[PDB]
Scaffold this active site. Structure first.
Site, PDB file in Angstrom:
ATOM      1  N   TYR A  35      -4.999   9.854  -0.632  1.00 37.91           N
ATOM      2  CA  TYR A  35      -3.611   9.842  -0.184  1.00 37.91           C
ATOM      3  C   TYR A  35      -2.526  10.026  -1.253  1.00 37.91           C
ATOM      4  CZ  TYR A  35      -5.548   8.146   4.271  1.00 37.91           C
ATOM      5  OH  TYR A  35      -6.265   8.019   5.429  1.00 37.91           O
ATOM      6  N   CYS A  61      -7.640   9.705   6.479  1.00 35.91           N
ATOM      7  CA  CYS A  61      -7.746   9.372   7.898  1.00 35.91           C
ATOM      8  C   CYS A  61      -6.449   9.835   8.549  1.00 35.91           C
ATOM      9  CB  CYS A  61      -7.915   7.869   8.020  1.00 35.91           C
ATOM     10  SG  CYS A  61      -8.805   6.967   9.384  1.00 35.91           S
ATOM     11  N   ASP A  66      -8.321   3.855  14.580  1.00 37.11           N
ATOM     12  CA  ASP A  66      -8.960   2.604  14.928  1.00 37.11           C
ATOM     13  C   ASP A  66      -7.895   1.734  15.577  1.00 37.11           C
ATOM     14  OD1 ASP A  66     -10.418  -0.158  13.011  1.00 37.11           O
ATOM     15  OD2 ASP A  66     -10.459   0.355  15.161  1.00 37.11           O
ATOM     16  N   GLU A  72       0.788  -1.230   0.000  1.00 38.18           N
ATOM     17  CA  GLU A  72       0.000   0.000   0.000  1.00 38.18           C
ATOM     18  C   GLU A  72       0.828   1.292   0.000  1.00 38.18           C
ATOM     19  OE1 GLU A  72      -2.753   0.569   3.233  1.00 38.18           O
ATOM     20  OE2 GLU A  72      -3.463   2.468   2.389  1.00 38.18           O
ATOM     21  N   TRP A 128      -8.923  -2.023   0.299  1.00 36.68           N
ATOM     22  CA  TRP A 128      -9.678  -0.908  -0.278  1.00 36.68           C
ATOM     23  C   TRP A 128     -10.881  -1.362  -1.099  1.00 36.68           C
ATOM     24  CZ3 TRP A 128      -9.433   4.111   0.921  1.00 36.68           C
ATOM     25  CH2 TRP A 128      -8.261   4.591   1.555  1.00 36.68           C
ATOM     26  N   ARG A 137      -6.597  11.960  12.528  1.00 38.34           N
ATOM     27  CA  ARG A 137      -7.883  12.420  13.023  1.00 38.34           C
ATOM     28  C   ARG A 137      -8.808  11.345  13.538  1.00 38.34           C
ATOM     29  NH1 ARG A 137     -11.819  10.940  10.304  1.00 38.34           N
ATOM     30  NH2 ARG A 137     -11.819  10.443   8.068  1.00 38.34           N
TER      31      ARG A 137
HETATM   32  C1  LIG Z   1      -4.077   1.414   8.282  1.00 46.64           C
HETATM   33  C2  LIG Z   1      -4.766   1.309   7.306  1.00 46.64           C
HETATM   34  C3  LIG Z   1      -5.531   1.248   6.053  1.00 46.64           C
HETATM   35  N1  LIG Z   1      -6.774   0.443   6.151  1.00 46.64           N
HETATM   36  C4  LIG Z   1      -7.919   1.107   5.447  1.00 46.64           C
HETATM   37  C5  LIG Z   1      -9.162   1.395   6.218  1.00 46.64           C
HETATM   38  C6  LIG Z   1     -10.368   1.604   5.457  1.00 46.64           C
HETATM   39  C7  LIG Z   1     -11.654   1.644   6.120  1.00 46.64           C
HETATM   40  C8  LIG Z   1     -11.757   1.488   7.558  1.00 46.64           C
HETATM   41  N2  LIG Z   1     -12.990   1.506   8.188  1.00 46.64           N
HETATM   42  C9  LIG Z   1     -13.140   1.303   9.547  1.00 46.64           C
HETATM   43  N3  LIG Z   1     -14.352   1.214  10.100  1.00 46.64           N
HETATM   44  N4  LIG Z   1     -12.011   1.170  10.323  1.00 46.64           N
HETATM   45  C10 LIG Z   1     -10.731   1.189   9.788  1.00 46.64           C
HETATM   46  O1  LIG Z   1      -9.681   1.134  10.699  1.00 46.64           O
HETATM   47  C11 LIG Z   1     -10.532   1.301   8.351  1.00 46.64           C
HETATM   48  C12 LIG Z   1      -9.260   1.255   7.664  1.00 46.64           C
HETATM   49  C13 LIG Z   1      -6.567  -3.669   7.320  1.00 46.64           C
HETATM   50  C14 LIG Z   1      -7.484  -3.245   6.310  1.00 46.64           C
HETATM   51  C15 LIG Z   1      -7.553  -1.860   5.948  1.00 46.64           C
HETATM   52  C16 LIG Z   1      -6.719  -0.864   6.588  1.00 46.64           C
HETATM   53  C17 LIG Z   1      -6.351  -5.084   7.486  1.00 46.64           C
HETATM   54  O2  LIG Z   1      -7.179  -5.920   7.126  1.00 46.64           O
HETATM   55  N5  LIG Z   1      -5.196  -5.441   8.053  1.00 46.64           N
HETATM   56  C18 LIG Z   1      -4.708  -6.784   8.443  1.00 46.64           C
HETATM   57  C19 LIG Z   1      -5.720  -7.874   8.806  1.00 46.64           C
HETATM   58  C20 LIG Z   1      -6.386  -8.558   7.615  1.00 46.64           C
HETATM   59  C21 LIG Z   1      -5.384  -9.221   6.678  1.00 46.64           C
HETATM   60  O3  LIG Z   1      -4.503  -9.973   7.163  1.00 46.64           O
HETATM   61  O4  LIG Z   1      -5.488  -9.000   5.451  1.00 46.64           O
HETATM   62  C22 LIG Z   1      -3.642  -6.654   9.531  1.00 46.64           C
HETATM   63  O5  LIG Z   1      -3.518  -7.581  10.362  1.00 46.64           O
HETATM   64  O6  LIG Z   1      -2.940  -5.618   9.539  1.00 46.64           O
HETATM   65  C23 LIG Z   1      -5.855  -1.296   7.667  1.00 46.64           C
HETATM   66  C24 LIG Z   1      -5.780  -2.688   8.030  1.00 46.64           C
HETATM   67  O1  LIG Z   2      -5.530   4.205   8.616  1.00 46.27           O
HETATM   68  C1  LIG Z   2      -6.666   4.307   8.901  1.00 46.27           C
HETATM   69  C2  LIG Z   2      -7.713   4.620   7.848  1.00 46.27           C
HETATM   70  C3  LIG Z   2      -9.065   5.266   8.520  1.00 46.27           C
HETATM   71  N1  LIG Z   2      -9.399   4.561   9.688  1.00 46.27           N
HETATM   72  C4  LIG Z   2     -10.829   4.701   9.937  1.00 46.27           C
HETATM   73  C5  LIG Z   2     -11.138   5.669  11.081  1.00 46.27           C
HETATM   74  C6  LIG Z   2     -12.655   5.662  11.085  1.00 46.27           C
HETATM   75  O2  LIG Z   2     -13.013   4.365  11.602  1.00 46.27           O
HETATM   76  C7  LIG Z   2     -13.079   5.797   9.615  1.00 46.27           C
HETATM   77  C8  LIG Z   2     -13.116   7.265   9.197  1.00 46.27           C
HETATM   78  O3  LIG Z   2     -14.177   7.933   9.900  1.00 46.27           O
HETATM   79  P1  LIG Z   2     -14.765   9.065   9.072  1.00 46.27           P
HETATM   80  O4  LIG Z   2     -14.291  10.376   9.542  1.00 46.27           O
HETATM   81  O5  LIG Z   2     -14.365   8.943   7.659  1.00 46.27           O
HETATM   82  O6  LIG Z   2     -16.232   9.015   9.141  1.00 46.27           O
HETATM   83  O7  LIG Z   2     -11.902   5.113   8.942  1.00 46.27           O
HETATM   84  C9  LIG Z   2      -8.433   4.289  10.637  1.00 46.27           C
HETATM   85  O8  LIG Z   2      -8.695   4.150  11.839  1.00 46.27           O
HETATM   86  N2  LIG Z   2      -7.129   4.170  10.223  1.00 46.27           N
END
Ligand SMILES: C#CCN(Cc1ccc2[nH]c(N)nc(=O)c2c1)c1ccc(C(=O)N[C@H](CCC(=O)O)C(=O)O)cc1
Ligand SMILES: O=c1ccn([C@H]2C[C@H](O)[C@@H](COP(=O)(O)O)O2)c(=O)[nH]1
Ligand SMILES: O=c1ccn([C@H]2C[C@H](O)[C@@H](COP(=O)(O)O)O2)c(=O)[nH]1
Lengths: 292, 292
Positions: free
Chosen positions: B111, B171, B197, B63, B85, B194
């Site tokens: 990004y 984010c 998670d 990524e 994504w 901002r």
């Molecule tokens: C940071 C960031 C970007 N993001 C993007 C992203 C997009 C929407 C979101 N939406 C919500 N509700 N919470 C998020 O934290 C979030 C993050 C896993 C997926 C996505 C991002 C995951 O699946 N990570 C693996 C577990 C699954 C796997 O093995 O594939 C891990 O263990 O790290 C981060 C981590």
């Molecule tokens: O690296 C990342 C990508 C975004 N998210 C999450 C945070 C929120 O759960 C959601 C964004 O909230 P909004 O402001 O978009 O509603 O995506 C993370 O925690 N970490």
């Protein structure tokens, strides 16, 4: 206060642990990167106007309004007895940074402009930008009303696409508002300052943004929560090291309170007069120089 | 670790002082605003790759390169078998947010695009923006190459003028770099996030920026310093609470190490194989459900 002290201790850390950095403005300074953020409770009307040194809250209030109006002309702060933007606006200085065809007093698309007209095309500080660019401030307010838990309440002045056009890059670049509802009220604010000048800089901005939170809080029918100052390149000028230690030995007095209004109802409708600060008992003022 | 342990505390702090909040994505959470930033050292090749739970390091790497390339098409990331994504780019999501004329997988000006083409007029993730917008990433590397003590090394994705055109608002919106030269090295990095998670996000981002940092330090000849993760709305998803005390009880294994390259010298020329991560000894993995 233990609030202002926490700040003093940082004024000492940057001193007993600072770093010797050759400064671009051409000056000897000590600096610490990303130190631990400063918090200030904004409750019970308390206003974080540091007492260990007379702060120009008169210029603070006046400049904030200038920001909200989206004005980018220093001449306007001059017409109000404020010369804080005279240097970065001097016909001489504009040249040094290549802005030679820019007329004097025009600070470029700084803060305010970005606050109310972000994407808008800047072109002379005397033009009316109503309707152009994106109005972060209005949005922030609107959201807090609509859905207050939003995690996107971001007010920024950092536009990489408009930097060169600026008489000086956004120093305090942006802040994120948050509202914790009781278990509604508590509007907090965490801002990010890329470059912080503990002597003149930090204090002024503390108050500057504490008001902001109060104003927006007030207008949104909320109570101000707390204010946390986050800093990156925190630094202190050598030509002040001594003029900071005497201060460090000073005992911090309790922070005064801020009383907003008599039903002022707009935010875009605030005046030097609508802000009331009571019980401010600071020490003897000290002529703070600087650099450019 | 005490690095990861500090993180663990923050996870329990949220559980104990967290605040029940209605989540926009829909599902319930607990949030703490402006918690004390997490610091991680990059000193001695150490890499803050959390150990109390397997982290998708590969997801993280692929990524970042994707980001750097300024790509905005999830499909690419899919051709490499990453699916992080696939959601916010799904045809169903795009319409829920209104981007009903946006072809699936087109995340919009997110990004990457902002990092290399900020000012640029985005339009379709398959268009060539070469030389369009401000190339922050390139200007940062450069200033660090020329004047390293620059208090303006900012890389941001937060473009208020583009937020709507995005599949999701940035984010981890931005980060400032800073270099402490000796009596040269130390490329520390402080990012503001901002919306954090603590579940999946934070960990993934600690790696993501820990690497960016090393990577850039690499092309600038510098050595990394440390990483400071600052966070706004820091939170947790209830449906993972019980799923955390279980982890809160694991004993953090020390962080592995990161050795970059074989003199890769550009930041634009990286690939999975250029990243060797020695000694990653995490505990088993934990299936956690996102929240669009
Ligand atoms: C940071 C960031 C970007 N993001 C993007 C992203 C997009 C929407 C979101 N939406 C919500 N509700 N919470 C998020 O934290 C979030 C993050 C896993 C997926 C996505 C991002 C995951 O699946 N990570 C693996 C577990 C699954 C796997 O093995 O594939 C891990 O263990 O790290 C981060 C981590
Ligand atoms: O690296 C990342 C990508 C975004 N998210 C999450 C945070 C929120 O759960 C959601 C964004 O909230 P909004 O402001 O978009 O509603 O995506 C993370 O925690 N970490
Ligand atoms: O509100 C403000 C405005 C300016 N400065 C200081 C920070 C730096 O000392 C210098 C700006 O550095 P650069 O613009 O070169 O990054 O002015 C502050 O501390 N606070």
């Amino acid at each position: 206060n233990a609030e202002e002290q926490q700040y003093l201790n940082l004024v000492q850390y940057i001193i007993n642990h600072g770093e010797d950095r050759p400064d671009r403005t051409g000056t000897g300074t000590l600096s610490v990167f990303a130190p631990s953020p400063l918090k200030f409770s904004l409750r019970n009307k308390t206003f974080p106007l540091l007492t260990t040194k007379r702060v120009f809250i008169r210029g603070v209030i006046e400049e904030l309004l200038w920001f909200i109006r989206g004005e980018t002309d220093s001449l306007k702060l001059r017409e109000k007895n404020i010369h804080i933007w005279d240097a970065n606006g001097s016909r001489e200085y504009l040249d040094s940074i290549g802005l030679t065809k820019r007329q004097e007093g025009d600070l470029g698309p700084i803060y305010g402009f970005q606050w109310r007209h972000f994407g808008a095309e800047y072109i002379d500080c005397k033009t009316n930008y109503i309707g152009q660019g994106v109005d972060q401030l209005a949005n922030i307010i609107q959201k807090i009303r609509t859905s207050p838990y939003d995690r996107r309440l971001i007010l920024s002045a950092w536009n990489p696409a408009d930097l060169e056009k600026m008489a000086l890059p956004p120093c305090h670049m942006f802040c994120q508002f948050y509202v914790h509802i009781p278990s509604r009220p508590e509007l907090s604010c965490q801002l990010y300052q890329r470059s912080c000048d503990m002597g003149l800089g930090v204090p002024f901005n503390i108050a500057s943004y504490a008001l902001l939170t109060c104003m927006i809080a007030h207008v949104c029918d909320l109570d101000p929560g707390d204010f946390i100052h986050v800093m990156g390149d925190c630094h202190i000028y050598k030509d002040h090291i001594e003029a900071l230690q005497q201060q460090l030995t000073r005992s911090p007095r309790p922070f005064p309170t801020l009383s907003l209004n008599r039903s002022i109802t707009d935010i875009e409708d605030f005046t030097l007069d609508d802000f009331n600060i009571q019980n401010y008992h600071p020490y003897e003022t000290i002529k703070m120089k600087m650099s450019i």
